[PDB]
């Protein structure tokens, strides 16, 4: 790549800011067939859970206006397989591609187990805590909806992680600011947001929800305005960097993420529509930067950070 | 290059009640070889981001074309919008995709049974055109709900060494009823069975030929990425405890029973 | 109209379930030029505030994928003008069109003043409480985000209203269920939902938010899955009827609203794209009902209500 | 009927740097009479629900057509998608809309000043074609950023009793600079001034002809409904305290100063 597109984030020395979002790129195996994965800034692989999980019953996806619903349920082969097979494959084939590991679980003990082990992977440069999961201990309340509960989790995971810890925020809250400050106070090195919103679709013939799980996560361009709003809200009072995502589909969206306060950008759902979306965004970024008087993403970050109040 | 392409619509005509036949022309037809692979077509509407998986019914090498038969929904569906495409229009396509039917793995002396139903029938056409170039017996058991929906009869009967029977639930045309009734008769000891149709019919077939080794079933699933990354289109391998099968990569076609790869 | 499309809700005897949403139809004046307003089931007119309001600075609208952002700020001529001019115009021209009055305010005292007076309008058959407003008394916290605060407001307004009171719920909450139960316990006759979500769009050339107000309300088909989810969640534990809205654009959407639990459906943003959207939906509803084995909306409501658990 | 229609594109050609001229044919052209009214066009993309307000540059009664000149943005804008429309394509249109220019309210002996800039220039064309059928002096002061953007010069100069001057900021072609420089010269005591251009230029004009009664300004605003219901496109009437003016209904054109109806 080139200097204009490079960003340095804790644990992440990215050649460009484009990172496929967790759950939308598997472990890179399938999309490697399409293009040289080395073209990417990094990759957020799908969630790893202490134990393997089959996931939810089908159907698991549904289409919405400019978005999609999914209720995959975090299917993954488990930590063991991931440590011995999935991660090694990426390191063996793309030694230099830094990968961000997404971590999920049903209770604090599960997150802790994964965080403590996954950092041993030579290629894993940072951890992304998926806190949108139901806390079985707290009746089923997502860790990402209570500031003190999220904070407790981040601290515990921080004490045991060997790489930087990024926490992915949920947009399904009344006020995201308290959760963000709390997580920052707990030791997080950065934040990523947003995970999906919640939606439902009904089948008119059957009169039943299309998804077997009833509710699903809503993603795609439809949610970009929400992502931009929350990112922007959080950037105003946090000193750690943010990796933004939610509805990014082109270089213009990426640049808009920067205007809101993001330091890097992840692309999820768009990969399903166009598997070459990331490389195209990467190639088009400079033309667009030229057009808007941006010397480099690095300079843009500081300009946006100082034009505050 | 070889994975995605803006194909050209050669023609598109409604061949049955809300069932269209689209002939596409493009280099992608070159990679084609196995019957049962599918294409992932993009809808010409920005608010519909997911591609529709449509099996390949047939292709013409020398002409560089492929044909797909697909049913459409109401004005709010993506297929409805595809059916509006005129000659010359470009269709953003992904494919060929999936594990096709195994044809290059069998004799010129075996009894072949091909059973299909409704929109599961089209991929079965290329399968017959492929088995023909080789040699032996074939008895195509096609099933439809009504004659209004009956498709491909001319091309199947226009095949040599092919015996064809058509069943119809209500709107009767051939032997009234479901293909199951047609299964009861078949005396010949078949060696291979290829299938593609409704989940109900697939249950009936697998059940009847419970231990037939060469029992091939083409499945359907709500899909997204279509390449194996997302895990949307998942199924259970040999019973619950085992491995998970992705219909878009491991399939569309799987080996015997309620699921084996 | 015809029997198949009729619905009886508290204070509302609707010829069909189609109602233009508040803020998207003015006071009926402009759209009357386009078609006979009598074709509609009812009309939710724009918010009335005790005092007239100019609203927010411009720009006030922005486009998003399958939706739009608006930051109008509830501009209205005030109660007086509304009582003497706007409402009388509708009664004089459409004596039989029952209208739903949307009420807004910055504090409890404002809501109370409007609720107590607006019911004197012969044509006003129900009140819709817009609770997504910032409570100046509680630091700026929207009344719709705290169950006890919303409940206090509903009770006060109920004690003074001469027509049924419908409360419009905000989707911008962590858990909508407690707010819904609380409002029902306080005396509300029904509920309408959802109001808009929050979004932001940035202008790449200026690097500033497109809207002068920065954040805006997000509406349109993009949000239908969210509306459907919340409506469905709330229908499971409330005994009062719900008028649904959020992304409805055609008869199929309307029917989907019914499957989730709505008793009637309001259409907002779609009017801007196609001013004849409501009449078209009304004409197409029966074909669609035929296709899906629905004798009448009234029967559909009971079928959906009993297919619970 | 008379408010919305699926018009036909007669032709569309790029007449300047990213500036297109679209000729539309339809019955709606019948309701047209005042210069300065606009159309609300729908984008052929389902994810873009808001219609784009584009002033009418001119129309041909006998031919039943109307012409619009509009600038396009990048591949993610709605206008870009409009510019892709070929002959025969249908454009969902709303209009005529708004309060046009008052032409049928003045003499054959007055001095008329018409000032325009960039994309504000097109509606000014029909205005001249309307004032011509009547009679007196007209001095069109057109302003552009560069020659690359200069539009309509032939048609304006092809008008009788019309004196035309062209200014250009950088990419010089006529008198270098902004139209303001051109205002300084004009000796004749004008009786009416019609304007349409950038907010900056409108400020300059109103300021110079501070008390000119017949001072007409065509405004621009982010709009939604385009009919007056939403209140998106709002402006202040005679100072802050007064009534609010909607650019889509009360305007596009308003009377003198920073705003009066
Ligand atoms: C491997 C495979 C091959 C197929 N081959 C054919 C074929 O050759 N001919 C044919 O007519 N049909 C085929 N189908 C079924 C066809 O994909 C669906 O009928 C079609 O995608 C429904 O899209 P829609 O345009 O109606 O959109 P909508 O109803 O608007 O729905 C939008 C989303 O729902 C998905 N969806 C809705 N219903 C189905 C369904 N029943 N199955 C799968 N996805 C669904 C759409 O694909 C899309 O992502 C195949 C399905 C699969 C999985
Ligand atoms: C009454 C009126 C008449 C106009 N007449 C003309 C004309 O004759 N020729 C011409 O070239 N332009 C005209 N414009 C400006 C033109 O409407 C905008 O340049 C155009 O709508 C921007 O749309 P977009 O395709 O770029 O979409 P996008 O940039 O994607 O934006 C989508 C939304 O932003 C709105 N929007 C964005 N920028 C503007 C802007 N500067 N002004 C208004 N809306 C905006 C769009 O209309 C739309 O609703 C007029 C504007 C108004 C209010
Ligand atoms: C199919 C699918 C599966 C996902 N799985 C995860 C996951 O494993 N972990 C996680 O943190 N996020 C998951 N995400 C959510 C995000 O990666 C992401 O926040 C996103 O959906 C919002 O961005 P997008 O609009 O670009 O998809 C998933 C999203 C999709 C569409
Ligand atoms: C321009 C605009 C103004 C609105 N003003 C109000 C209002 O006055 N009061 C209120 O309760 N809702 C208001 N709404 C919000 C809703 O009426 C409605 O809940 C809606 O936006 C969701 O439905 P839709 O997707 O069909 O617009 C407004 C929405 C829009 C688009
Ligand atoms: S469609 Fe994504 S794994 Fe099959
Ligand atoms: S665009 Fe809605 S009132 Fe002007």
Bridge partners of A266, per DSSP, are A19
CB spacing of D47 vs A221 below 8 angstroms: yes
Distance B248 CA to ligand 5 centre (A): 6
Residue A270 contacts residue A277 (beta carbons within 8 Å): yes
Give catalytic residues of C, as residue numbers: 133
CA neighbours closer than 13 Å in the CB half-sphere of residue B83: 21
C293, burial (CB in 10 Å: exposed 0-12, middle 13-18, buried 19+): exposed
- Closest-CA residue to B192 (of B147, B255, B235): B255
* Nearest-by-CA chain A residue for B50: A273
CA neighbours closer than 13 Å in the CB half-sphere of residue D122: 23
Angle at C171 between CA C244 and CA A210, to 5 degrees: 60
Place of tokens 């919640």: A198
d(CA A157, CA A105): 12
Residue B178 contacts residue B169 (beta carbons within 8 Å): yes
Q: What DSSP line would sit under D32-99, residue for residue? A: --STT-EEEEPPS-TT--SPEEEE--EEETTTTEEEEEEE--STTSHHHHHTTPPTT-EEEEEEEESB
* C-beta contacts of B79-84 below 8 A and 24+ residues apart: B79/B52, B81/B43, B81/B44, B81/B45, B81/B48, B82/B20, B82/B22, B82/B41, B82/B43, B82/B44, B82/B52, B83/B12, B83/B14, B83/B20
**Structure determination method:** X-ray
Cβ density class B29-39: b for 16+ within 10 Å, e for less: beebebbbbbb
d(CA C148, CA C154): 10
Distance C72 CA to ligand 6 centre (A): 11
CA dihedral C129, C131, C132, C137 (to 10 degrees): 140
Coil, helix or strand at residue D173: coil
DSSP tag of A239: -
> Would you say how long chain B is, in residues?
261
d(CA A16, CA A34): 19
Does an H or E element contain A217, and which? strand A216-219
- Identify whether D259 is preceded by a cis peptide bond (ω within 30 of 0): no
d(CA C115, CA B24): 63
Which residues of chain B are within 8 Å of residue D45 when distances are taken between CB atoms? Answer: 45-47
| Phi and psi, residue A199, nearest 5° | -145, 175
From residue A276, how far is each of A25, A39, A185, B150, D28 by CA, in Å? 12, 11, 38, 39, 44
Angle at B168 between CA B167 and CA B169, to 5 degrees: 130
- Closest-CA residue to D122 (of D79, D82, D66, D73): D66
The structure tokens listed for D179 are 């139209």
* Helical residues (DSSP H) of D117-212, grouped into ranges: 122-132, 153-157, 179-185, 199-208
Q: How many CB atoms lie within 10 A of CB D86?
A: 8
Residue D245 contacts residue D251 (beta carbons within 8 Å): yes
The structure tokens listed for A84 are 């011995």
CATH number at residue C195: 3.20.20.70
Residues with CB under 6 Å of ligand 3 are: A 21-24, 46-47, 70, 72, 74, 102, 130, 168, 195-196, 217, 219-220, 223, 245-248, 267-270; B 230
Does an H or E element contain D113, and which? strand D112-117
* Helical residues (DSSP H) of D188-241, grouped into ranges: 199-208
Q: Which domain holds residue A236?
A: 1-309
From residue D211, how far is each of B3, D103, D204 by CA, in Å? 68, 20, 13
Does an H or E element contain C273, and which? helix C270-273
For chain C, the maximum distance between any two Cα atoms, rounded to a whole number of angstroms, is 55
Q: State whether the Cα torsion A284-A286-A292-A296 is positive or negative.
A: positive
From residue C244, how far is each of A181, B213, C193, C194 by CA, in Å? 35, 54, 5, 7
CB spacing of B231 vs A25 below 8 angstroms: no
d(CA C129, CA C157): 9
Angle at B45 between CA B40 and CA B46, to 5 degrees: 100
Catalytic residue among A24, A133, A157, A278: A133
- Identify whether A194 is preceded by a cis peptide bond (ω within 30 of 0): yes
- Closest-CA residue to A32 (of A83, A94, A98, A86): A94
d(CA D256, CA D216): 6
CA distance B77 to chain C (A): 11
CB spacing of B224 vs A62 below 8 angstroms: no
Q: How many CB atoms lie within 10 A of CB B116?
A: 27
d(CA C85, CA C93): 12
A187 a known binding residue?
A: no
- Closest-CA residue to B252 (of B77, B127, B106): B127
- Identify whether A59 is preceded by a cis peptide bond (ω within 30 of 0): yes
d(CA D4, CA C34): 10
- Closest-CA residue to C212 (of C96, C93, C90, C71): C71
Cβ density class C48-64: b for 16+ within 10 Å, e for less: bbbebbbbbebbbbbbb
Coil, helix or strand at residue A164: coil
DSSP tag of A309: -
DSSP tag of A30: H
| Listed resolution, Å | 2.2
Please give the tally of structural domains in chain A: 1
Give the closest ligand to the alpha carbon of residue C219: 4
Secondary structure of C76-108 as H, E, C letters:
ECCHHHHHHHHHHHHHHHCCCCCEEEEECCCCH
* Helical residues (DSSP H) of C174-264, grouped into ranges: 177-185, 224-235, 251-260
d(CA A197, CA A212): 18
Residue C130 contacts residue C191 (beta carbons within 8 Å): no
Q: State whether the Cα torsion D232-D237-D242-D246 is positive or negative.
A: negative
Q: How many CB atoms lie within 10 A of CB B172?
A: 14
Q: Which domains does chain D have, with CATH numbers?
A: 1-99 (2.40.30.10), 103-219 (3.40.50.80), 220-261 (2.10.240.10)
Q: What DSSP line would sit under chain B, residue for residue? A: --SEEEEEEEEEEEEETTEEEEEEESGGGGT--STT-EEEEPPS-TT--SPEEEE--EEETTTTEEEEEEE--STTSHHHHHTTPPTT-EEEEEEEESB----TT--SS--EEEEEEGGGSHHHHHHHHHHHTT---EEEEEEEEEGGG--SHHHHHTSTTEEEEEEEEEE-SSEES-HHHHHHH--S--SEEEEES-HHHHHHHHHHTTT-SEEEEE-----SSSSSSS-TTEEESSSTTS-EEETTTT-BEEETTTTB-
CA distance C43 to chain B (A): 26
Place of tokens 């943005």: D73
Distance D161 CA to ligand 6 centre (A): 37
The structure tokens listed for A14 are 């990215």
Number of Cβ pairs closer than 8 Å across B and C?
8
Q: Which chains touch A (3 or more CB pairs under 8 A)?
A: B, C, D
Interface test with A, best of D48, D49, D75 (most A CBs within 10 A): D75
CA neighbours closer than 13 Å in the CB half-sphere of residue B131: 31
From residue B19, how far is each of B69, B90, B176, B202 by CA, in Å? 7, 20, 22, 22
CB spacing of A252 vs C204 below 8 angstroms: yes
Residue A297 contacts residue A258 (beta carbons within 8 Å): yes
- Identify whether D20 is preceded by a cis peptide bond (ω within 30 of 0): no
d(CA A92, CA D43): 48
d(CA C113, CA D186): 59
Does an H or E element contain A266, and which? strand A264-267
Bridge partners of D92, per DSSP, are D6
B231, burial (CB in 10 Å: exposed 0-12, middle 13-18, buried 19+): buried
First vs last C-alpha separation in chain A: 34
| Phi and psi, residue A108, nearest 5° | -55, -45
Angle at B65 between CA B12 and CA B124, to 5 degrees: 80
A195 a known binding residue?
A: yes
């Amino acid at each position: 790549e080139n200097n204009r597109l490079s960003v340095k984030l804790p644990g992440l020395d990215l050649k460009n800011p484009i990172i496929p979002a967790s759950g939308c790129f598997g472990f890179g195996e399938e999309y490697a067939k399409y293009y040289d994965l080395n073209k990417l800034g990094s990759i957020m692989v799908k969630a790893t859970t202490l134990h393997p999980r089959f996931g939810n019953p089908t159907p698991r996806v549904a289409e919405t206006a400019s978005g999609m619903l999914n209720a995959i349920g975090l299917q993954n082969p488990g930590l063991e397989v991931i440590m011995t097979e999935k991660l090694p494959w990426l390191n063996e084939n793309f030694p230099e591609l830094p990968i961000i590991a997404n971590v999920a679980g049903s209770e604090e003990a599960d997150y802790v187990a994964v965080c403590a082990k996954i950092g041993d992977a030579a290629n894993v440069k940072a951890i992304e805590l998926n806190i949108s999961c139901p806390n079985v201990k707290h009746g089923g309340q997502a860790f990402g909806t209570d500031p003190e509960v999220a904070a407790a989790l981040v601290k515990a995971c921080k004490a045991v992680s060997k790489v930087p810890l990024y926490v992915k925020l949920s947009p399904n809250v009344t006020d995201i600011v308290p959760i963000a400050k709390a997580v920052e106070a707990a030791g997080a090195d950065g934040l990523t947001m947003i995970n999906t919103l919640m939606g439902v679709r009904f089948d008119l013939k059957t009169r039943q929800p299309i998804l077997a799980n009833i509710t699903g996560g809503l993603s795609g361009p439809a949610i970009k305005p929400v992502a931009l709003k929350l990112i922007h809200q959080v950037a105003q009072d946090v000193d750690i960097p943010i990796i933004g995502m939610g509805g990014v589909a082109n270089a213009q969206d990426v640049l808009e993420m920067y205007m809101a306060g993001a330091s890097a950008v992840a692309v999820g759902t768009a990969n399903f529509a166009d598997p070459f979306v990331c490389p195209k965004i990467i190639d088009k970024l400079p033309e667009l930067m030229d057009q808007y008087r941006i010397e480099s993403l690095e300079s843009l970050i500081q300009e946006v950070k100082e034009g505050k109040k | 290059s070889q994975l995605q392409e803006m194909m050209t619509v050669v023609s598109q005509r409604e061949v049955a009640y809300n069932i269209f036949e689209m002939v596409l022309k493009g280099t992608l037809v070159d990679e084609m070889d196995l019957p049962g692979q599918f294409l992932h077509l993009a809808v010409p509407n920005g608010a519909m981001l997911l591609r529709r998986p449509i099996s390949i019914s047939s292709w013409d090498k020398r002409a560089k074309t492929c044909t797909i038969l697909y049913r459409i929904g109401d004005e709010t569906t993506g297929t409805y919008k595809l059916s509006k495409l005129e000659s010359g229009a470009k269709v953003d396509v992904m494919g060929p995709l999936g594990n096709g039917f195994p044809v290059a793995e069998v004799t010129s002396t075996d009894k072949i049974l091909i059973i299909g139903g409704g929109i599961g029938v089209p991929p079965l056409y290329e399968l017959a055109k492929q088995l023909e170039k080789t040699g032996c017996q074939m008895t195509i058991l096609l099933g439809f709900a009504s004659e209004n929906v009956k498709i491909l009869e001319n091309e199947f009967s226009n095949l040599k060494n092919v015996t064809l029977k058509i069943a119809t639930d209500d709107g009767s045309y051939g032997t009234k009823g479901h293909v199951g009734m047609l299964m009861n008769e078949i005396d010949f000891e078949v060696d291979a069975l290829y299938t593609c149709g409704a989940p109900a019919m697939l249950k009936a077939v697998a059940k009847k030929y419970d231990q037939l080794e060469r029992l091939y079933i083409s499945m359907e699933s709500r899909m997204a990425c279509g390449i194996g990354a997302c895990y949307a289109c998942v199924e259970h391998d040999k019973e619950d405890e085992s491995h998970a099968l992705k219909v878009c990569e491991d399939g569309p076609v799987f080996l015997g029973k309620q699921l084996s790869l």
